Symmetry: D2
Subunit: 333 residues, 4 copies
């Protein structure tokens, strides 16, 4: 129903576009990317190494990108304040470039005639939302908004269920993470973060992340009670969260499984998944959940100290939540 514009046609930009057409929950009417012209967009959207060929039509017709017969207006504007969102009829804009994450920069989209702006990344100052955790706190007064990180959309729905039930005294998270566009194929320059320059095919690579800490802004009761870090490993897609956490109320592993499977079939349905199957990462390729709890993989030392494992397609899970949020925003207009 709501008409959407996407700034940036990267993995997130294209996969949000793909998720909008598959779910039908929003309508993509404009795309802006200064480094990908229209024919190149046809090709980049049609063919995907990770998620296969688009099931649908995609063609260049009279200067438009046409997907499933729906023409999309294309801008090639390096400055966000110069994108005529309002001319193209784009009410919400997905800011997915990764370089306009502050409320000051992301706000440029309001100049072109856009009413609301969703940042597809963590934000220093924009209010962060995670579907099924704190989305119901959104209101019409917020015009610039963040959907947090993929890792945050994994840990947070799991953290919520475990806090609400047994209470998290303190937790340390490791994410074993698929490679991303920011890494390099062979040892190369990554001036800010030296490890991230090292060959992504050859290396387990330790990285910093604020994704755990950030759970404290979508679940305030956990503020200052979570942090962690990442290992980038050589797979194309799908990441796993490893949450090590002390609970204050006693929790048998079967209890943890009981409450998580309850949440998965009830209000967190389609956001937090549950499985007892002998799954590996490629089993969650193109899986739309934010988080799928892996019963068999985790381990408890005692009733108050556990290791919990949850899978997430860092590409497809996150992109589907960016669509799910925009549909909630538009239901509350």
């Amino acid at each position: 129903k709501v008409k959407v514009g996407v700034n940036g046609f990267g993995r997130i930009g294209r996969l949000v576009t793909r998720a909008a057409f598959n779910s039908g929950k929003v309508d993509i009417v404009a795309i802006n990317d200064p480094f990908i012209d229209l024919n190149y967009m046809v090709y980049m959207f049609q063919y995907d190494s990770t998620h296969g060929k688009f099931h649908g039509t995609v063609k260049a017709e009279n200067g438009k990108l046409v997907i499933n017969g729906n023409p999309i207006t294309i801008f090639q504007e390096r400055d966000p304040s110069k994108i005529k969102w309002g001319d193209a009829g784009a009410e919400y804009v997905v800011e997915s470039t990764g370089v306009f994450t502050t409320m000051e920069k992301a706000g440029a989209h309001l100049q072109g005639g856009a009413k609301r702006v969703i940042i597809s990344a963590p934000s220093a100052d924009a209010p962060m939302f995670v579907m099924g955790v704190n989305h119901e706190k959104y209101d019409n007064s917020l015009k610039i908004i963040s959907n947090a990180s993929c890792t945050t959309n994994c840990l947070a729905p799991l953290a919520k269920v475990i806090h609400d039930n047994f209470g998290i005294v303190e937790g340390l998270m490791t994410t074993v993470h698929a490679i991303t566009a920011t890494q390099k194929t062979v040892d190369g320059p990554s001036g800010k973060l030296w490890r991230d320059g090292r060959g992504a095919l050859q290396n387990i690579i330790p990285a910093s992340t604020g994704a755990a800490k950030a759970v404290g802004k979508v679940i305030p009761e956990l503020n200052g009670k979570l942090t962690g870090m990442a290992f980038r490993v050589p797979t194309a897609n799908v990441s796993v969260v490893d949450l090590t956490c002390r609970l204050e109320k006693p929790a048998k592993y079967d209890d943890i499984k009981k409450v998580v499977k309850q949440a998965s079939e009830g209000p967190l349905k389609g956001i937090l998944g549950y499985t007892e199957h002998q799954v590996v990462s490629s089993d969650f390729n193109s899986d739309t959940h934010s988080s799928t709890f892996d019963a068999g993989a985790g381990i408890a030392l005692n009733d108050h100290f556990v290791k919990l494992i949850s899978w997430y397609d860092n590409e497809f899970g996150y992109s589907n939540r960016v669509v799910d949020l925009m549909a909630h925003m538009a239901s509350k207009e």
Copy 2:
């Protein structure tokens, strides 16, 4: 000095053999493998995808394996009771097939005339040792010994230092582990461990391990205080330990750093390393340490709750610790 026989020319057999000649600490004089003919042994020892071409000479000469000029006796004996280790003059036998890990099956090497057996794997009942942790607890009465698991040999020297200075109340360990010979190139049969059957190039694979619980047996104070699990990731070699633990005494991160660094210079030198460098996994390929503490990669929630990172070359570190163990058993005969 002590004359060693190796059962099984697998990854461990060849690299134990390789580390022997490189360190000179022991003298290899026999190999038994019944699926690998002498000519094939030349090639498999000469060429290594992970550790590069053997720096030295290897040839098949008059039915022996001649490495740097030292002729080695070759057996093709499917049954260990039937290997004449004594005739060949092998004081110690390394038991590296991974199927003779119980004291009963391992003992067969004594029938052939060997006096001692080192098991290059965890054992149900054979006594386990970790260099730098309980190797002095070894005495001439023991004739069937285990050198534990490569993972235990990474976690133990770190647990020891941390527990010595701060006390470990409890810990949960994740190891992000390189692929091994037991895994498959594509989805294949692993009847008892369905996940280890899934294609190793495609998948992050969750796995059970006893390496953390095993640390209870070489540091008895830690018995019942540690467990863990592993992820298999598509890299050829080098693995990392992620120890989340609670300490009863306050430990500022700079205090954890000082003590581990101080241990690495002192009694534990060459077993536990210390680094502040921006390292990635391949920086440790063919590194002879058991455990290298990674200062920058670790993170602390607070003075009591820490996530500590240690690298290990699961192939080369472990193989050097088997050679080291046998060296120490010789210094006390």
Copy 3:
């Protein structure tokens, strides 16, 4: 309509089974595998790293494997002679273990009451068929038959169109091939084929193949005019043929492209594909074509000396041809 048994639930067995239900061209009524129980068959069939989760339903129910509501008799017989194919109504048996490839060993399925046997591998003596090339030479006298290799099914349809139109004086093929179930994760034992034991993730591995020479059996006019070799490379699936051939009659690259495009739209449709798109290997993952000509990747030196590139999903292409071969066999009884 024709009722089919599968011997071996390996990569080919399961994907032949998957292709039978997806296409609906045959009915799988029976499977034999001595190393894979009923339960484990549910999991291996349902979850696939390469081709994703089975679209449809799979459960164990009353000792039978139930796919899309169709029950399947499960045998655990090591000896092919002793499989009661006739009691379960298996008229054709797919011999997919790759250890019963001779007409003598393959005949063993007729003992248990099967009428016809399709070896899902090349055979030393059994007549070999390629769909769209020589499958019309099949008749009812034949009971033991081979569907050739995945590589022959890629090369033969292209070779046919090139020979038909311009005449192949001679040619040499390279296949750059994805990793298979016979390779090793780390340097391991491969006594017949020393290169094939070197670690499949680390290495480009040269290999011998008879697949180019076998095109001489399905197109007798090319007997003695083709040979070739392979490189194994670290991808899970999808391979490519590289055909360097001399042409009798003069052929500009544009004429080659026309006749290949024509053949792909006409009598070789669904078997030979044709594309001018900027494709890469993963664009053919789960592509059911035997052979897809890549127009942009090929190059001519001159009107008589050219290099032609053709993609093949070595798993899913070949598996669909086995079902197509059996369906054509049912039509001619």
Copy 4:
């Protein structure tokens, strides 16, 4: 003896530097790179994922890079016309950025006081050389020179031996090539070459190359008689040439082995290699040959039509030829 400056501290710039210090054939006195400051250089040079950690000493000392006690002056200029090579005393400049490969752009180094420039890539107009093939046609008049490409350096020495002895009438070349710094970790923008945009870990990627044709410039007799293409595969390093050629004089395979072994032992020593071992790509990691002919991997259809296989470390071999070419240039001053 000759003093050398390196423009660009990428894979080629660092490994030429590494080869200069290990062979001792030239002295690196200066390095320019605008995106990599002094302390970053110490790290990127010290630790290499492919070639291992540097064997020697490297430190930042008083604004100079000090390698094995030799201090190196570190520029940070974007416009080569403004590097003060003269003042640092760099007589030869290695132009290794990839963006200054024309005589006019590379000529900019002469304005800074350098006397000659070696382009470490193919050039549109600068004369190209391959050591062991046409390097003796260099003379003191040439101030701007190209060292051709890693692939040309592999094909040219093999093509010269085959052509000197049997006569190359026509050849088509495929190179199966390791991933490079121009590729992407996941599907990403590559506006001029769309296939090079697709995820390098997931894909066999066809590509154009002028390497086989360029052989016609260093061996004028084969001008217009060679061309080829490439496939990029997911390995970190080491590539292979696949040469399908037709000969004028008859050549049994054993005659081809004989004359290639002969040239590898005699005047092409250290440039062209020869082996009969069951080698795989990793067996050539850090191998310094231009080309190693793999006798067992190649195949003949007949005495006039053969496919020949030659391996090359596309990073280390090429880097060592750059040092060698500068050693030759210094000798003819």
